[PDB]
Every structure is written in C-alpha cells, then in structure tokens.
Amino acid sequence: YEAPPATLEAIHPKGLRVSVPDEGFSLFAFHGKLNEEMEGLEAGHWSRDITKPKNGRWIFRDRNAALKIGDKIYFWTFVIKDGLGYRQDNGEWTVEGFVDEA
C-alpha cells in the first residue's frame, strides 16, 4: 500500500478540488496536470504542499483547472505519515464528481 486514493472532484471551469482521507499524515504535496500525463515523476502544472489537514482530511482547491465531467487526470502525490513517507502512482483518475467553489 502507498497512500490512500485521492478524491479529485470536478469543480467549475475556473478551478478544481482534490481531497484525501487523512490516516495520520503530517505533510502533503500536490503536483499534477489535466488530460496530460507526465514522466519521471516531475512537477506537472499544479504545485503546492499541504502542511496541515482541514476538517479531518487534506482538502485542496485550485483556480486554473478548467475541466468538466468526462475529463481525466494523471499525476502523483507525496505524503509523510509517522515519518514513513508515502506517494501515489499510476497517475490515472476519471472525472466523476461535480462541485461548487462556494
């Protein structure tokens, strides 16, 4: 196992939302793109690091993600729980959830 599945929603064409279930992490890193996959684990388009959860889980929101039900995502994420260190791979997520940046 390497970090839980990320719940990437589908916000309006003016951003996006991506949250994940916290099981004891202390640091989170978000670096992915849209309708485009990267190689050699590099910094795609998005770049940020969550140094603290919110509401019990690590929630994130962008303002440059213009996608809609039907799109896809391919990237990875870095985490740090109990000083172990985890990260998701495969880079593949289909949009199947809408949301509002309100």
45-89-93 Cα angle (round to 5)? 65
Determine the Cα–Cα distance for residues 76 and 31; give it in Å rounded to an integer.
6
**Which residues are known binding-site members?**
49, 76-78, 87
Experimental method used, please? NMR
Tokens of 26: 């202390």
Question: For the domain bounded by 1-102, which CATH number is listed?
Answer: 2.60.40.2140
- Report which DSSP code applies to 5: P
- Report which DSSP code applies to 6: P
Single-letter amino acid code for the residue at 50: I
**SS3 for 62?**
coil
Determine the Cα–Cα distance for residues 88 and 94; give it in Å rounded to an integer.
15
**SS3 for 61?**
strand
Tokens of 5: 């599945």
Determine the Cα–Cα distance for residues 24 and 96; give it in Å rounded to an integer.
27
**Which residues are known binding-site members for substrate?**
49, 76-78, 87
Nearest to 85 by CA among 31, 43, 29: 29
Q: Where does 9-101 show beta strands of DSSP type E?
A: 18-21, 25-31, 48-50, 57-58, 72-73, 76-81, 86-88, 93-94
Structural domain spans, the chain: 1-102
